[PDB]
Nucleic acid binder design. Sequence first.
RNA 1: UUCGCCCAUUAAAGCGGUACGUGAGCUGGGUUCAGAACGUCGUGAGACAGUUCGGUCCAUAUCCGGUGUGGGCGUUAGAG
RNA 2: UCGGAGAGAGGCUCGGUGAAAUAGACAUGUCUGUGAAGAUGCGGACUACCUGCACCUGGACAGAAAGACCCUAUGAAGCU
RNA 3: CGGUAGGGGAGCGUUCCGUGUUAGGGAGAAACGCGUGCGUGAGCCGCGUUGGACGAAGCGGAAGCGAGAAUGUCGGCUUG
RNA 4: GGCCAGUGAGACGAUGGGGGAUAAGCUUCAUCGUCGAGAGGGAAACAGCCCGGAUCACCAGCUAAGGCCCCUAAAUGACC
RNA 5: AACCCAGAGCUAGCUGGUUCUCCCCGAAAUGCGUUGAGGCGCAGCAGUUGACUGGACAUCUAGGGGUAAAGCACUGUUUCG
RNA 6: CUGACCGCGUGCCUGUUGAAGAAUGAGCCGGCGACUCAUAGGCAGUGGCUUGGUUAAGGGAACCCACCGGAGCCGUAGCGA
RNA 7: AUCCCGUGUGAAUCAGCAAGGACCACCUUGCAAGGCUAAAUACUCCUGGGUGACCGAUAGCGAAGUAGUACCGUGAGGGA
RNA 8: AGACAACCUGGCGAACUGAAACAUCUUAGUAGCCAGAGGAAAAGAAAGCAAAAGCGAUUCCCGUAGUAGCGGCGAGCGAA
Lengths: 109, 119, 72, 171
Amino acid sequence: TKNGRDSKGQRLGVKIYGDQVAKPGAIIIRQRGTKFHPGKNVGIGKDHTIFALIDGLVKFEKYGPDKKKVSVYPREIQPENPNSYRARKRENFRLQREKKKARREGYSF
Amino acid sequence: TRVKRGYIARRRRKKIRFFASSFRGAHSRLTRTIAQQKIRALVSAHRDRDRQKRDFRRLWITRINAAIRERGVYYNYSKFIHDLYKRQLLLNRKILAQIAILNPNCIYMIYNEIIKKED
Amino acid sequence: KGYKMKTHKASAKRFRVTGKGKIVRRRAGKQHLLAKKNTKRKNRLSKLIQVDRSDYDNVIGALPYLKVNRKV
Amino acid sequence: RKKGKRKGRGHAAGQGGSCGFGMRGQKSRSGPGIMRGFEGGQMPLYRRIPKLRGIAGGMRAGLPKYVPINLRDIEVAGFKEGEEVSLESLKAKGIINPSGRERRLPLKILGEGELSTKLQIKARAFSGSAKEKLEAAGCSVTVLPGRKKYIKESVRKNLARADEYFAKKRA
RNA sequence: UUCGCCCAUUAAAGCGGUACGUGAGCUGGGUUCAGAACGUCGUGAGACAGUUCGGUCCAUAUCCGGUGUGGGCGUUAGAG
RNA sequence: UCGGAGAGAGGCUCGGUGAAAUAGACAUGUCUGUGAAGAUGCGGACUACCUGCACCUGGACAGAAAGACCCUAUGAAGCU
RNA sequence: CGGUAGGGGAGCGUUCCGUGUUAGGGAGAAACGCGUGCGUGAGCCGCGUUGGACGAAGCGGAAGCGAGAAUGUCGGCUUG
RNA sequence: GGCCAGUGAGACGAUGGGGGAUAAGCUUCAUCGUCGAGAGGGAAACAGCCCGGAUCACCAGCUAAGGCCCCUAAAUGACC
RNA sequence: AACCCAGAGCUAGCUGGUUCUCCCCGAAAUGCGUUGAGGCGCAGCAGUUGACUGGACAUCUAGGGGUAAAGCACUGUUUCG
RNA sequence: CUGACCGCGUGCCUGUUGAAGAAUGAGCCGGCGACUCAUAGGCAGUGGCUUGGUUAAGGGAACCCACCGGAGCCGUAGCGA
RNA sequence: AUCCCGUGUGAAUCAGCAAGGACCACCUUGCAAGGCUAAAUACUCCUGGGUGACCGAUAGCGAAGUAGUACCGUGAGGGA
RNA sequence: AGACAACCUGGCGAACUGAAACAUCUUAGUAGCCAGAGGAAAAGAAAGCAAAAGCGAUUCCCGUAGUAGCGGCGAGCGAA
Ligand SMILES: [Mg+2]
Ligand SMILES: [Mg+2]
Ligand SMILES: [Mg+2]
Ligand SMILES: [Mg+2]
Ligand SMILES: [Mg+2]
Ligand SMILES: [Mg+2]
Ligand SMILES: [Mg+2]
Ligand SMILES: [Mg+2]
Ligand SMILES: [Mg+2]
Ligand SMILES: [Mg+2]
Ligand SMILES: [Mg+2]
Ligand SMILES: [Mg+2]
Ligand SMILES: [Mg+2]
Ligand SMILES: [Mg+2]
Ligand SMILES: [Mg+2]
Ligand SMILES: [Mg+2]
Ligand SMILES: [Mg+2]
Ligand SMILES: [Mg+2]
Ligand SMILES: [Mg+2]
Ligand SMILES: [Mg+2]
Ligand SMILES: [Mg+2]
Ligand SMILES: [Mg+2]
Ligand SMILES: [Mg+2]
Ligand SMILES: [Mg+2]
Ligand SMILES: [Mg+2]
Ligand SMILES: [Mg+2]
Ligand SMILES: [Mg+2]
Ligand SMILES: [Mg+2]
Ligand SMILES: [Mg+2]
Ligand SMILES: [Mg+2]
Ligand SMILES: [Mg+2]
Ligand SMILES: [Mg+2]
Ligand SMILES: [Mg+2]
Ligand SMILES: [Mg+2]
Ligand SMILES: [Mg+2]
Ligand SMILES: [Mg+2]
Ligand SMILES: [Mg+2]
Ligand SMILES: [Mg+2]
Ligand SMILES: [Mg+2]
Ligand SMILES: [Mg+2]
Ligand SMILES: [Mg+2]
Ligand SMILES: [Mg+2]
Ligand SMILES: [Mg+2]
Ligand SMILES: [Mg+2]
Ligand SMILES: [Mg+2]
Ligand SMILES: [Mg+2]
Ligand SMILES: [Mg+2]
Ligand SMILES: [Mg+2]
Ligand SMILES: [Mg+2]
Ligand SMILES: [Mg+2]
Ligand SMILES: [Mg+2]
Ligand SMILES: [Mg+2]
Ligand SMILES: [Mg+2]
Ligand SMILES: [Mg+2]
Ligand SMILES: [Mg+2]
Ligand SMILES: [Mg+2]
Ligand SMILES: [Mg+2]
Ligand SMILES: [Mg+2]
Ligand SMILES: [Mg+2]
Ligand SMILES: [Mg+2]
Ligand SMILES: [Mg+2]
Ligand SMILES: [Mg+2]
Ligand SMILES: [Mg+2]
Ligand SMILES: [Mg+2]
Ligand SMILES: [Mg+2]
Ligand SMILES: [Mg+2]
Ligand SMILES: [Mg+2]
Ligand SMILES: [Mg+2]
Ligand SMILES: [Mg+2]
Ligand SMILES: [Mg+2]
Ligand SMILES: [Mg+2]
Ligand SMILES: [Mg+2]
Ligand SMILES: [Mg+2]
Ligand SMILES: [Mg+2]
Ligand SMILES: [Mg+2]
Ligand SMILES: [Mg+2]
Ligand SMILES: [Mg+2]
Ligand SMILES: [Mg+2]
Ligand SMILES: [Mg+2]
Ligand SMILES: [Mg+2]
Ligand SMILES: [Mg+2]
Ligand SMILES: [Mg+2]
Ligand SMILES: [Mg+2]
Ligand SMILES: [Mg+2]
Ligand SMILES: [Mg+2]
Ligand SMILES: [Mg+2]
Ligand SMILES: [Mg+2]
Ligand SMILES: [Mg+2]
Ligand SMILES: [Mg+2]
Ligand SMILES: [Mg+2]
Ligand SMILES: [Mg+2]
Ligand SMILES: [Mg+2]
Ligand SMILES: [Mg+2]
Ligand SMILES: [Mg+2]
Ligand SMILES: [Mg+2]
Ligand SMILES: [Mg+2]
Ligand SMILES: [Mg+2]
Ligand SMILES: [Mg+2]
Ligand SMILES: [Mg+2]
Ligand SMILES: [Mg+2]
Ligand SMILES: [Mg+2]
Ligand SMILES: [Mg+2]
Ligand SMILES: [Mg+2]
Ligand SMILES: [Mg+2]
Ligand SMILES: [Mg+2]
Ligand SMILES: [Mg+2]
Ligand SMILES: [Mg+2]
Ligand SMILES: [Mg+2]
Ligand SMILES: [Mg+2]
Ligand SMILES: [Mg+2]
Ligand SMILES: [Mg+2]
Ligand SMILES: [Mg+2]
Ligand SMILES: [Mg+2]
Ligand SMILES: [Mg+2]
Ligand SMILES: [Mg+2]
Ligand SMILES: [Mg+2]
Ligand SMILES: [Mg+2]
Ligand SMILES: [Mg+2]
Ligand SMILES: [Mg+2]
Ligand SMILES: [Mg+2]
Ligand SMILES: [Mg+2]
Ligand SMILES: [Mg+2]
Ligand SMILES: [Mg+2]
Ligand SMILES: [Mg+2]
Ligand SMILES: [Mg+2]
Ligand SMILES: [Mg+2]
Ligand SMILES: [Mg+2]
Ligand SMILES: [Mg+2]
Ligand SMILES: [Mg+2]
Ligand SMILES: [Mg+2]
Ligand SMILES: [Mg+2]
Ligand SMILES: [Mg+2]
Ligand SMILES: [Mg+2]
Ligand SMILES: [Mg+2]
Ligand SMILES: [Mg+2]
Ligand SMILES: [Mg+2]
Ligand SMILES: [Mg+2]
Ligand SMILES: [Mg+2]
Ligand SMILES: [Mg+2]
Ligand SMILES: [Mg+2]
Ligand SMILES: [Mg+2]
Ligand SMILES: [Mg+2]
Ligand SMILES: [Mg+2]
Ligand SMILES: [Mg+2]
Ligand SMILES: [Mg+2]
């Protein structure tokens, strides 16, 4: 008859993607049914909310042959770049803040 | 402490009126109108100090085109100028206009140098 | 005898301050209709929460004698 | 002394014309505003939140009943050995300035910091850690009597009948 | 009332535009103003894209525009 | 129909006395185009010596203030 | 280094108070009128064939402290 | 984080669409540009299209968009 | 529902007005709620003041997706055989 | 000082998505004419003390003001109805 | 609770009575149903002295002259 | 007996307003009106405070304190 009723969008969908970082407890996906399946190091909720049990990179996989599942793997961060563009500019900012604050009270006259 | 406005107003008004001397009609009389008219005057002035720099180049170029067109059948302003540059001369358009009027023979010579060299 | 500001009383029966100077309040909704609220939710509605930065103005404005640090 | 804005004079100055009230409507209109705690007619924040625990019914508010002092303060102060601390001698050196409500109060000692001296202390009360640290440092702790609570005779008979029971039982 | 119908003619009794072309040119209705009555709705006060009888719009032309009617000055000396 | 003449009171000229509503400033053409979508004032053409007087009322969204009609206001009052 | 609502900085002026019964002033003060003067401007500094007795600068203080709009408002004077 | 403002009527244009008649200078959303709050040039004139973002002086010079018969700056240029 | 005075400078989320100069920065017309719709609260986006920071503009790789296109494997729909 | 002739040049305010508007307002001129005061709260800027800070009313050679006046008040403990 | 009043009922005298924030016990404090009394405090139609970061003829009182006058209103009242 | 500016006591006693409406509440026992007396009036010599320690008629100022509380527990009111 007469239309025009509706619902606020529920905020469902992927919260963290593949190869991003997760905290323990961090929600990876809110879904209605299961459009994904829990993998390893990964718990599932009552509403089929998928959440991480472990810090690390989250990876999506073929559940096979058709469906998909998500699991979390622990990563390793050793490789801090000692000398690179990133390091160079961030350092530069530090040292410029230091210098520019030190040449104030160090002003004669 | 009560303060009458006193002359603080009338001075301002007067110093505006001085501005607007020789405006026809009620533009030279009534304060309230005079105000506006001052502003507009100042405004045009500012505008046309910019227009000015446009208009004399207008003019100069025109006169130059006239001055050259006399010599060759096929000669222009455009041609001329292009020729002045590929011959590496610095003279700007004011000077070529004033030399066009006030020393015509000179411009004939210049043309003869550009011609000799383009030859 | 001048006029001194009055504490807005209906605001002071609601908000108070912690020793370090932040404002706190109760949470709304644990009064009736509890049976149909799960225990977990009920626990969450039992605790004391620091008021949202947003409202700090209105509150502060109506409780002038509340000693409050906004952490400056 | 920074010179004040005089609103409504000139534009080039400052807040001229409107004065910084922008265009129209309630906030630019002369007169008392709208109440500080009020949002548009939506149920105001303070009204949609429940009243604080005890206050809400008329259970009396909690009030300080002693003037708390740590041992920190008694260390920093100029107390030489043997000296009486009490209440009075803490006003003397000023480390406590009592106001009306505080005047009418007793004194209580709270352990913090480690006292080195032998002092003679008088107060109506001590925390556990307090008198522990005090009797550990060799200080004499005088506990002053509070004012007797008046009791009618019948309740003395009851409370004494108790003590007679305990006494006949242990002996 | 736009519309339209008829009478008697007529060469023919065109259709549109111009703020209903035209209310500081004129006049009826319409904005159904206040009174009253009928039908109808409403317990009611009152109502009606119902009907009915009664029912106040002024104006010395500044400028433009116009119809006439002059002066001044020009028309290279002045006139008829 | 279909207007005509005449008499008075004005109108008109001369002398005397002498207001008013109005009014941003006004050196105040027409067509057409444009534009807050109907322009003396912006554009393009066209037409226009300067200035009176008598007449005429098409324009200046002419003049005489809250629009009676419609809506708003947590306005006002009367009535049920 | 465009700029409305709007925020911030730096200034100018008016009348009064302190310094102060000040400097100066019937050898002409305030004011009024003028400037080939100086300022980014508000304004300042200089000058008077006016005027006829008061009153700066500096360093500070205070406000009945700056007008073109309110169908503002009171007087004056026009237009018609 | 602190202190303390306005704003909460938007307009068209490009694009994706819905309502409507794949009508409206209509209406309602989405991602952008300009106007709002932006002058200059091009567009006959011409908020929203194109170029470009105005500290200020110069009777200097080079260009953008756009143009080079006359009004009106530049070719009455060349070759198909 | 008279007049005159007083409460009264009533009240007006409405309309009108709001006066000197220079310098710097500079918006919004959106969301939610509202006896709300031309008002207001909070958020969003100004200014000024601090505390932390290391980015932005580019370049490439990696994620999940179900639009444009496309399709008849399902759900409808449809023509003829 | 005047101004032959050429070019450029759509009064001001208010208020709007937007105005030269045929949108409002002003006949003209000169005056009067609007974010003020008191008392508190918060924040900033300056001082003064930090042997913690400060006085209120009150008294004062009339005022101001020396010198008093610690009653109060702010900071030194929190948690909890 | 205490305090004070309409209607109606209605005690006790110190071995009492009232108060101590419903009420009862206990303790503490006080003695209603009869009166009267200065100062510290409020005010300006005024009187006498004093001062003024108060006005100076649109200001200051409505009023520096016939001012509550002229004038207006039946009157209350307005009012230069 | 009448007159008498403000202040004061007693008696009658509003409403606009605030609460973003309004009815309890607020405005406020305010204005107004009536009556009365004084240079002040009123209050005043504990049938009072307090809390297990004490005070010693009334009035007024500072403070406690925007605290305890009261309140469509809203607007607000607000002690000792
Ligand atoms: Mg949905
Ligand atoms: Mg479970
Ligand atoms: Mg004066
Ligand atoms: Mg003034
Ligand atoms: Mg000239
Ligand atoms: Mg604390
Ligand atoms: Mg419960
Ligand atoms: Mg705020
Ligand atoms: Mg101020
Ligand atoms: Mg400023
Ligand atoms: Mg203005
Ligand atoms: Mg403001
Ligand atoms: Mg305005
Ligand atoms: Mg506003
Ligand atoms: Mg108001
Ligand atoms: Mg209030
Ligand atoms: Mg409750
Ligand atoms: Mg507590
Ligand atoms: Mg204290
Ligand atoms: Mg025939
Ligand atoms: Mg024929
Ligand atoms: Mg016709
Ligand atoms: Mg007709
Ligand atoms: Mg007409
Ligand atoms: Mg009729
Ligand atoms: Mg009937
Ligand atoms: Mg019907
Ligand atoms: Mg009749
Ligand atoms: Mg005429
Ligand atoms: Mg004519
Ligand atoms: Mg003629
Ligand atoms: Mg002639
Ligand atoms: Mg002649
Ligand atoms: Mg002639
Ligand atoms: Mg005739
Ligand atoms: Mg006749
Ligand atoms: Mg006659
Ligand atoms: Mg005559
Ligand atoms: Mg007149
Ligand atoms: Mg003309
Ligand atoms: Mg058009
Ligand atoms: Mg046209
Ligand atoms: Mg034209
Ligand atoms: Mg023109
Ligand atoms: Mg006409
Ligand atoms: Mg006529
Ligand atoms: Mg016009
Ligand atoms: Mg409403
Ligand atoms: Mg109402
Ligand atoms: Mg720039
Ligand atoms: Mg700028
Ligand atoms: Mg501004
Ligand atoms: Mg000066
Ligand atoms: Mg002076
Ligand atoms: Mg002298
Ligand atoms: Mg002089
Ligand atoms: Mg003077
Ligand atoms: Mg000077
Ligand atoms: Mg000076
Ligand atoms: Mg003399
Ligand atoms: Mg001086
Ligand atoms: Mg001076
Ligand atoms: Mg004033
Ligand atoms: Mg004026
Ligand atoms: Mg008028
Ligand atoms: Mg007048
Ligand atoms: Mg909204
Ligand atoms: Mg809207
Ligand atoms: Mg608006
Ligand atoms: Mg559009
Ligand atoms: Mg579009
Ligand atoms: Mg699509
Ligand atoms: Mg189609
Ligand atoms: Mg569409
Ligand atoms: Mg549209
Ligand atoms: Mg583009
Ligand atoms: Mg705007
Ligand atoms: Mg822009
Ligand atoms: Mg432009
Ligand atoms: Mg252009
Ligand atoms: Mg651009
Ligand atoms: Mg640039
Ligand atoms: Mg070039
Ligand atoms: Mg040319
Ligand atoms: Mg050719
Ligand atoms: Mg009657
Ligand atoms: Mg009436
Ligand atoms: Mg009132
Ligand atoms: Mg008012
Ligand atoms: Mg009024
Ligand atoms: Mg009302
Ligand atoms: Mg900028
Ligand atoms: Mg936008
Ligand atoms: Mg509204
Ligand atoms: Mg806001
Ligand atoms: Mg910001
Ligand atoms: Mg994919
Ligand atoms: Mg992809
Ligand atoms: Mg798929
Ligand atoms: Mg979909
Ligand atoms: Mg498709
Ligand atoms: Mg199929
Ligand atoms: Mg099929
Ligand atoms: Mg010209
Ligand atoms: Mg032009
Ligand atoms: Mg022109
Ligand atoms: Mg409009
Ligand atoms: Mg106009
Ligand atoms: Mg407009
Ligand atoms: Mg409009
Ligand atoms: Mg006016
Ligand atoms: Mg007008
Ligand atoms: Mg003023
Ligand atoms: Mg204010
Ligand atoms: Mg103040
Ligand atoms: Mg303050
Ligand atoms: Mg300090
Ligand atoms: Mg004192
Ligand atoms: Mg004294
Ligand atoms: Mg004194
Ligand atoms: Mg009693
Ligand atoms: Mg009591
Ligand atoms: Mg009793
Ligand atoms: Mg009574
Ligand atoms: Mg008896
Ligand atoms: Mg007693
Ligand atoms: Mg007795
Ligand atoms: Mg009694
Ligand atoms: Mg007695
Ligand atoms: Mg008595
Ligand atoms: Mg006079
Ligand atoms: Mg006078
Ligand atoms: Mg005079
Ligand atoms: Mg008598
Ligand atoms: Mg009498
Ligand atoms: Mg008497
Ligand atoms: Mg009421
Ligand atoms: Mg009412
Ligand atoms: Mg009020
Ligand atoms: Mg109300
Ligand atoms: Mg209201
Ligand atoms: Mg006395
Ligand atoms: Mg007496
Ligand atoms: Mg006695
Ligand atoms: Mg007695």
